Design an enzyme around this catalytic site. Structure first.
Site, PDB file in Angstrom:
ATOM      1  N   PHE A  80     -18.571 -15.907  15.907  1.00 52.70           N
ATOM      2  CA  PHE A  80     -17.334 -16.673  15.848  1.00 52.70           C
ATOM      3  C   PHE A  80     -17.028 -17.145  17.259  1.00 52.70           C
ATOM      4  O   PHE A  80     -16.694 -16.342  18.129  1.00 52.70           O
ATOM      5  CB  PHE A  80     -16.178 -15.817  15.322  1.00 52.70           C
ATOM      6  CG  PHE A  80     -16.219 -15.594  13.839  1.00 52.70           C
ATOM      7  CD1 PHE A  80     -17.257 -14.866  13.259  1.00 52.70           C
ATOM      8  CD2 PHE A  80     -15.236 -16.132  13.016  1.00 52.70           C
ATOM      9  CE1 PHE A  80     -17.316 -14.679  11.879  1.00 52.70           C
ATOM     10  CE2 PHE A  80     -15.284 -15.951  11.633  1.00 52.70           C
ATOM     11  CZ  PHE A  80     -16.328 -15.222  11.065  1.00 52.70           C
ATOM     12  N   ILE A 125     -14.517 -19.339  19.036  1.00 58.02           N
ATOM     13  CA  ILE A 125     -13.262 -20.073  19.008  1.00 58.02           C
ATOM     14  C   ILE A 125     -12.720 -20.350  20.407  1.00 58.02           C
ATOM     15  O   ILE A 125     -12.907 -19.555  21.329  1.00 58.02           O
ATOM     16  CB  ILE A 125     -12.196 -19.302  18.188  1.00 58.02           C
ATOM     17  CG1 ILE A 125     -12.427 -19.528  16.690  1.00 58.02           C
ATOM     18  CG2 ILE A 125     -10.796 -19.760  18.564  1.00 58.02           C
ATOM     19  CD1 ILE A 125     -13.784 -19.094  16.194  1.00 58.02           C
ATOM     20  N   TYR A 128     -14.543 -19.942  23.926  1.00 55.77           N
ATOM     21  CA  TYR A 128     -15.785 -19.218  23.701  1.00 55.77           C
ATOM     22  C   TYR A 128     -16.943 -20.109  23.270  1.00 55.77           C
ATOM     23  O   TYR A 128     -18.097 -19.685  23.307  1.00 55.77           O
ATOM     24  CB  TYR A 128     -15.585 -18.104  22.676  1.00 55.77           C
ATOM     25  CG  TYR A 128     -14.810 -16.936  23.223  1.00 55.77           C
ATOM     26  CD1 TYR A 128     -13.468 -16.754  22.900  1.00 55.77           C
ATOM     27  CD2 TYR A 128     -15.411 -16.026  24.089  1.00 55.77           C
ATOM     28  CE1 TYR A 128     -12.742 -15.692  23.429  1.00 55.77           C
ATOM     29  CE2 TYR A 128     -14.696 -14.963  24.624  1.00 55.77           C
ATOM     30  CZ  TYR A 128     -13.363 -14.803  24.289  1.00 55.77           C
ATOM     31  OH  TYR A 128     -12.650 -13.751  24.811  1.00 55.77           O
ATOM     32  N   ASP A 163     -21.054 -10.646  18.909  1.00 54.83           N
ATOM     33  CA  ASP A 163     -20.162 -11.489  19.702  1.00 54.83           C
ATOM     34  C   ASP A 163     -20.984 -12.594  20.364  1.00 54.83           C
ATOM     35  O   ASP A 163     -22.169 -12.417  20.630  1.00 54.83           O
ATOM     36  CB  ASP A 163     -19.437 -10.676  20.782  1.00 54.83           C
ATOM     37  CG  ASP A 163     -18.383  -9.744  20.210  1.00 54.83           C
ATOM     38  OD1 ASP A 163     -17.685 -10.133  19.249  1.00 54.83           O
ATOM     39  OD2 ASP A 163     -18.240  -8.623  20.736  1.00 54.83           O
ATOM     40  N   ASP A 223     -20.126 -14.203  23.430  1.00 59.50           N
ATOM     41  CA  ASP A 223     -20.168 -14.073  24.883  1.00 59.50           C
ATOM     42  C   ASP A 223     -21.207 -13.023  25.276  1.00 59.50           C
ATOM     43  O   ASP A 223     -20.911 -12.050  25.968  1.00 59.50           O
ATOM     44  CB  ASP A 223     -18.780 -13.703  25.437  1.00 59.50           C
ATOM     45  CG  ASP A 223     -18.149 -12.520  24.712  1.00 59.50           C
ATOM     46  OD1 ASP A 223     -17.118 -12.001  25.198  1.00 59.50           O
ATOM     47  OD2 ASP A 223     -18.670 -12.115  23.655  1.00 59.50           O
ATOM     48  N   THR A 246     -12.444   6.765  21.544  1.00 62.23           N
ATOM     49  CA  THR A 246     -11.172   6.062  21.441  1.00 62.23           C
ATOM     50  C   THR A 246     -10.851   5.635  20.011  1.00 62.23           C
ATOM     51  O   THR A 246     -10.466   4.491  19.768  1.00 62.23           O
ATOM     52  CB  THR A 246     -11.142   4.818  22.354  1.00 62.23           C
ATOM     53  OG1 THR A 246     -12.158   3.896  21.946  1.00 62.23           O
ATOM     54  CG2 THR A 246     -11.383   5.218  23.800  1.00 62.23           C
ATOM     55  N   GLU A 277     -12.624  -2.787  15.725  1.00 59.80           N
ATOM     56  CA  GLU A 277     -13.538  -1.712  16.076  1.00 59.80           C
ATOM     57  C   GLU A 277     -13.094  -0.348  15.555  1.00 59.80           C
ATOM     58  O   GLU A 277     -13.924   0.503  15.235  1.00 59.80           O
ATOM     59  CB  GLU A 277     -13.716  -1.667  17.593  1.00 59.80           C
ATOM     60  CG  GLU A 277     -14.636  -0.573  18.086  1.00 59.80           C
ATOM     61  CD  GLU A 277     -15.060  -0.797  19.519  1.00 59.80           C
ATOM     62  OE1 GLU A 277     -15.886  -1.705  19.758  1.00 59.80           O
ATOM     63  OE2 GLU A 277     -14.557  -0.078  20.408  1.00 59.80           O
ATOM     64  N   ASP A 280     -23.914  -3.431  29.259  1.00 62.31           N
ATOM     65  CA  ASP A 280     -23.257  -4.212  30.297  1.00 62.31           C
ATOM     66  C   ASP A 280     -23.873  -3.663  31.578  1.00 62.31           C
ATOM     67  O   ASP A 280     -23.473  -2.602  32.064  1.00 62.31           O
ATOM     68  CB  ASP A 280     -21.742  -3.974  30.303  1.00 62.31           C
ATOM     69  CG  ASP A 280     -20.991  -5.007  31.141  1.00 62.31           C
ATOM     70  OD1 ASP A 280     -21.499  -5.381  32.218  1.00 62.31           O
ATOM     71  OD2 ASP A 280     -19.893  -5.441  30.725  1.00 62.31           O
TER      72      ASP A 280
END
Ligand SMILES: CCCCCCO[C@@H]1O[C@H](CO)[C@H](O)[C@H](N)[C@H]1O[C@@H]1O[C@@H](C)[C@@H](O)[C@@H](O)[C@@H]1O
Ligand SMILES: [Hg+2]
Ligand SMILES: [Hg+2]
Ligand SMILES: [Hg+2]
Ligand SMILES: [Hg+2]
Length: 263
Positions: free
Chosen positions: A59, A61, A64, A129, A131, A163, A221, A244
């Protein structure tokens, strides 16, 4: 279904583990995909014989749409190379989608922002994703009815640290004594049926929370982690599939950085 052809390759060693530094199988016997755990040649064979079609959804949008070019180009070099691929780009800027040359047997559909469609065009849905960029091999070793990816930031932590949504008022609530792993919201998939069931479960769960005037700590998430806790994934991807490097470096445990974030 159909038998494999003659193949020559290293004989698996029963008394010689592939990897001894990491858990390569979950308590429910679902493999944990690490470099060195699979023979891509065998896996490619199995999936090609079934003429498998993989759908990759993203996606893009607003601002992005800018990551599409790098995403699609890198995917073209490392994603399911040799297999049929169908990219589904959901965007609010149809004309902003870059013109990327695709290998044969691979196509792209632009969807401006149904399910029955996915059921007839692909066999597996992979959701990630935009990005991001592929830096290494990401292939059929990940295909299975349902899979989640280990979060690069908690793969070495205890559940209590995860988390998860800790509020009992949220449908995504997970007590401190429950939990196998903390999965990433930006890389999951499986058969079309299993992926739609998951997304349908989460949408309903999210509505119930909204009606209750509450939003899970990490939104989407949080619900994914809850769904995967009750519906154990048939395969788990190691952090090699979403890392990352700028933020976490390159641990010895990771022999490959396959799918990473773009700073
Ligand atoms: C990818 C780096 C992992 C360690 C940083 C903390 O990661 C964040 O974790 C929460 C859940 O606790 C959310 O999943 C965030 N989206 C995570 O952020 C991560 O880091 C930022 C800078 C972005 O790269 C984001 O995409 C990552 O998930
Ligand atoms: Hg999806
Ligand atoms: Hg859910
Ligand atoms: Hg959702
Ligand atoms: Hg979800």
């Amino acid at each position: 279904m159909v038998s494999l052809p003659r193949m020559v390759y290293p004989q698996p060693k029963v008394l010689t583990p592939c990897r001894k530094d990491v858990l390569v199988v979950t308590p429910w016997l679902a493999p944990i995909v690490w470099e060195g755990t699979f023979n891509i040649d065998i896996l490619n064979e199995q999936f090609r014989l079934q003429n498998t079609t993989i759908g990759l959804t993203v996606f893009a949008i607003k601002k992005y749409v800018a990551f599409l070019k790098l995403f699609l180009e890198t995917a073209e070099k490392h994603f399911m190379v040799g297999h049929r691929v169908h990219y589904y780009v959901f965007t609010d800027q149809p004309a902003a989608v870059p013109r990327v040359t695709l290998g044969t047997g691979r196509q792209l559909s632009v969807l401006e922002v149904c399910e029955r469609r996915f059921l007839s065009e692909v066999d597996y849905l992979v959701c990630v994703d935009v990005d991001m960029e592929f830096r290494d091999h990401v292939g059929v070793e990940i295909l299975t009815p349902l899979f989640g990816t280990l979060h690069p930031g908690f793969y070495g932590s205890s559940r209590e640290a995860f988390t998860y949504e800790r509020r009992p008022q949220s449908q995504a609530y997970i007590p401190k004594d429950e939990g196998d792993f903390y999965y990433l919201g930006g890389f999951f998939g499986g058969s079309v049926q299993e992926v739609q069931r998951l997304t349908r479960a989460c949408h309903q769960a999210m509505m119930v929370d909204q009606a209750n005037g509450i939003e899970a700590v990490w939104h989407d998430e949080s619900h994914l982690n809850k769904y995967l806790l009750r519906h154990k994934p048939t395969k788990v991807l190691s952090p090699e599939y979403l890392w990352d490097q700028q933020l976490l470096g390159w641990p010895a445990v990771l022999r490959k950085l396959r799918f990473t974030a773009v700073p």
